[PDB]
A paper describes a structure:
Among all bacterial pathogens, Legionella pneumophila maintains the largest known set of translocated substrates, delivering over 300 proteins to the host cell via its Type IVB, Icm/Dot translocation system. Through detailed structural and functional analysis, we show that metaeffector activity derives from a diverse range of mechanisms, shapes evolution, and can be used to reveal important aspects of each cognate effector's function. After release into the host cell, translocated bacterial substrates (effectors) regulate one another through several different functional interactions: indirectly, through counteracting modification of a shared host target, or directly through either steric complex formation or direct modification of one effector by another.
To define the mechanism of LegL1 inhibition of RavJ, we first solved the crystal structure of the N‐ and C‐terminal portions of RavJ spanning amino acid residues 1–228 and 251–371, respectively. Structures for amino acid residues 1–228 and 251–371 of RavJ were solved separately to a resolution of 1.3 and 1.9 Å, respectively. A conserved motif (highlighted in gray) is located in the C‐terminal domain with surface exposed residues H316, R319, and H320. While expression of full‐length RavJ showed a severe growth defect in a spot dilution assay, mutation of each of the putative catalytic residues or the adjacent W172 to alanine fully relieved toxicity as did substitutions in the conserved C‐terminal motif. Use of the otherwise full‐length loop mutant (H316A/R319A/H320A) as bait abrogated these interactions.
Author numbering: 251 to 357, 362 to 371
The structure:
């Protein structure tokens, strides 16, 4: 309930993100063009990096956690990746989001959970 490492925070975040993307108010269909999906995801991620006042109010709790600051910085980098044109499918975008907490070395999926993918 209080995430004790960055991966645990990301797991809470994934659950929230999935709920938000499945919100009926997006009016997203799985046969929509990919640009429409990617843009809706980008809007939600952007709102997340700006304090979550539009889409993340229900999950206001996560913004107080220690891990939020760094996680917001990583999501901000991904929004930049969207803006740079790195994603042509929403599937690839949510895979990036899925796996953002893992790293190489040492010191189901989001696709399946989201209806329009």
């Amino acid at each position: 309930t209080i995430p004790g490492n960055f991966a645990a925070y990301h797991e809470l975040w994934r659950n929230a993100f999935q709920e938000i993307m499945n919100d009926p108010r997006h009016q997203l269909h799985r046969n929509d063009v990919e640009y429409k999906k990617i843009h809706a995801i980008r809007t939600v991620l952007d709102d997340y990096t700006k304090g979550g006042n539009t889409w993340w109010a229900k999950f206001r709790r996560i913004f107080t956690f220690h891990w939020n600051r760094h996680h917001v910085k990583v999501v901000d980098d991904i929004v930049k990746e969207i803006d740079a044109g790195n994603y042509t499918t929403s599937r690839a975008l949510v895979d990036r989001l899925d796996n953002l907490a893992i790293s190489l070395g040492s010191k189901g999926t989001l696709k399946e959970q989201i209806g329009f993918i």
